[PDB]
Amino acid sequence: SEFAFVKIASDGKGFTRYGEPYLIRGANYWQGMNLGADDCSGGDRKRMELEIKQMAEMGINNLRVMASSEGPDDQPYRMRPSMMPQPGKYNEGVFVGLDYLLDTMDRYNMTAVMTLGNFWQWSGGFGQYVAWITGNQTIPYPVGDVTYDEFTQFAARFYNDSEIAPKANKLFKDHIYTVQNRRNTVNGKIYKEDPVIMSWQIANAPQEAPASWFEEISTFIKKGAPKHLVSAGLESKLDEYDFDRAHDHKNIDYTTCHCWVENWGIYDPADPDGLPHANEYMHDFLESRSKWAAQLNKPIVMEEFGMARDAWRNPEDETYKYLPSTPTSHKDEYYQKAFNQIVSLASNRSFSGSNFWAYGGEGRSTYPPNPYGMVWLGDPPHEPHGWYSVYSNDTTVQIIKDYNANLLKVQKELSK
Ligand SMILES: OC[C@H]1O[C@@H](O[C@H]2[C@H](O)[C@H](O)[C@@H](O)O[C@@H]2CO)[C@@H](O)[C@@H](O)[C@@H]1O
Numbered sequence: 145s146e147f148a149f150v151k152i153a154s155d156g157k158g159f160t161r162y163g164e165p166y167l168i169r170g171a172n173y174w175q176g177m178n179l180g181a182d183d184c185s186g187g188d189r190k191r192m193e194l195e196i197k198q199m200a201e202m203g204i205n206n207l208r209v210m211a212s213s214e215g216p217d218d219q220p221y222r223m224r225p226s227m228m229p230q231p232g233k234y235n236e237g238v239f240v241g242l243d244y245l246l247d248t249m250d251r252y253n254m255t256a257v258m259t260l261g262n263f264w265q266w267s268g269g270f271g272q273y274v275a276w277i278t279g280n281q282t283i284p285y286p287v288g289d290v291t292y293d294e295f296t297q298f299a300a301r302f303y304n305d306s307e308i309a310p311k312a313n314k315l316f317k318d319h320i321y322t323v324q325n326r327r328n329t330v331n332g333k334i335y336k337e338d339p340v341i342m343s344w345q346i347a348n349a350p351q352e353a354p355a356s357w358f359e360e361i362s363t364f365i366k367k368g369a370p371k372h373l374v375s376a377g378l379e380s381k382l383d384e385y386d387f388d389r390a391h392d393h394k395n396i397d398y399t400t401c402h403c404w405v406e407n408w409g410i411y412d413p414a415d416p417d418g419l420p421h422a423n424e425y426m427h428d429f430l431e432s433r434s435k436w437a438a439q440l441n442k443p444i445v446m447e448e449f450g451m452a453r454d455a456w457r458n459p460e461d462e463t464y465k466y467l468p469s470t471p472t473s474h475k476d477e478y479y480q481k482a483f484n485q486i487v488s489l490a491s492n493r494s495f496s497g498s499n500f501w502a503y504g505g506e507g508r509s510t511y512p513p514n515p516y517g518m519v520w521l522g523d524p525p526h527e528p529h530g531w532y533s534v535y536s537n538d539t540t541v542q543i544i545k546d547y548n549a550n551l552l553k554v555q556k557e558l559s560k
Pocket residue numbers: 264292348349379404407448501523524527532
């Protein structure tokens with residue numbers, strides 16, 4: 145009956161679906177729900193339908209999408225219009241967008257990773273929940289003087305403050321319940337009975353949350369939808385100790401890592417010699433995290449990674465860095481080498497696939513905002529438009545297409 149839900153294999157070294165091994169030929173597409181909405185709510189459904197076609201044609205079987213976003217709608221640095229402008233109150237025009245995303249995905253035989261919250265500010269996230277509870281809407285956004293560490297310590301109260309946390313979490317739960325139980329208006333299916341969803345993911349990139357928190361949340365989610373896998377969203381950017389705190393629990397079915405060389409100060413795109421130090425880092429990152437996954441006997445996916453355009457061709461001009469016309473040779477080699485390393489590890493069942501960050505499609509950073517002020521592409525509005533996006537005609541597209549073909553070949557070999 146349940147032939148079609150993605151499962152863990154019984155040895156615990158990869159995924160199964162339709163009784164066969166299942167490898168992740170993935171991409172991130174967090175802007176999907178918003179592009180799926182009607183024109184009245186700032187959507188562009190004909191564009192969404194086309195962007196999914198482009199992805200199927202390049203060999204993609206899995207999308208990691210965003211399934212939350214918090215008002216109020218008068219805030220900078222976030223998706224607008226919001227999905228849930230106030231607690232328990234929903235924008236139905238935006239919800240319908242998500243219905244459509246999951247229906248298209250279906251017609252293209254793709255599966256979805258459903259992200260239910262955000263630690264960062266671009267969909268409201270944990271910072272907004274805290275604001276709602278303290279009644280103080282002045283979130284310390286990290287611009288000007290406010291540093292990242294200062295904003296981080298503010299949002300972390302969602303689970304580290306003994307008075308805030310219980311309240312915050314109650315409202316957080318209300319949302320999960322609502323989504324798990326949504327009836328798809330386009331095709332009738334209840335979300336929790338839908339084999340198109342691969343898994344429910346707690347949140348994007350929790351920052352040093354305690355183990356007990358992971359323990360209770362995973363259990364809650366699993367009980368809400370017993371047919372589905374359950375995932376954590378961790379970057380795994382620290383040590384093995386950090387890795388275990390998040391992943392070692394009955395109801396965390398598999399593991400994740402996100403890799404960001406520029407953001408962490410490893411790689412500098414304006415430096416023409418900068419590339420090989422980043423390649424080494426990528427290399428060691430994949431093997432160390434592999435061991436950690438093995439130690440717990442669970443599968444692993446690199447659900448996030450990316451790189452800038454060739455800024456070093458004109459280092460003294462900041463804007464040159466974001467033009468679509470600027471080439472991506474550093475980025476193309478960096479991708480290629482990591483794909484080749486993953487193919488070889490999955491040959492030996494020590495790695496399950498990946499999702500690059502992120503697909504831009506038809507969007508371009510030179511286009512004007514829509515009426516809600518959104519320039520829709522792969523880069524969230526806390527970040528310069530066009531930073532990391534892969535456009536429909538970039539040269540990196542061939543590279544992604546080839547990697548997907550190589551990894552399907554590996555999947556067939558392990559089915560013998
Ligand atoms: O930057 C691309 C994506 O990076 C991840 O999170 C970043 C975050 O934006 C912070 O700027 C930085 O300190 O590092 C974080 C994790 O390494 C993504 O999950 C998204 O936030 C970004 O679009």
